[PDB]
């Protein structure tokens, strides 16, 4: 655009939103299992078809 400069598909703010860096799951030892999956943050981990990161196809 006439005013679209240095902002696009790339996110505002901290620009780490797009690289989508996943994380290692919480582990509790024997007998000390506190519940960790209770939030929605236990997400459906389904990497079925399409791309990741910024590379996912758009329309």
């Amino acid at each position: 655009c006439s005013s679209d400069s240095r902002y696009k598909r790339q996110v505002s703010g901290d620009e780490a939103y797009l690289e989508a860096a996943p994380l290692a799951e919480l582990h509790a030892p024997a007998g000390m299992i506190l519940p960790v999956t209770s939030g929605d943050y236990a997400i459906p981990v389904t990497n079925g078809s399409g791309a990741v990161g910024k590379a996912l196809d758009i329309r």
Binding site: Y17, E19, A20, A21, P22, L23, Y41, I43, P44, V45, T46, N47, G48, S49, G50, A51, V52, G53, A55, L56, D57
Partner: peptide, 15 residues
């Protein structure tokens, strides 16, 4: 959970 976009969002959500 099968579509041509769920690969990123799964990787996005764990981030």
């Amino acid at each position: 959970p099968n579509s041509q976009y769920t690969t990123d969002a799964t990787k996005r959500l764990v981030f």
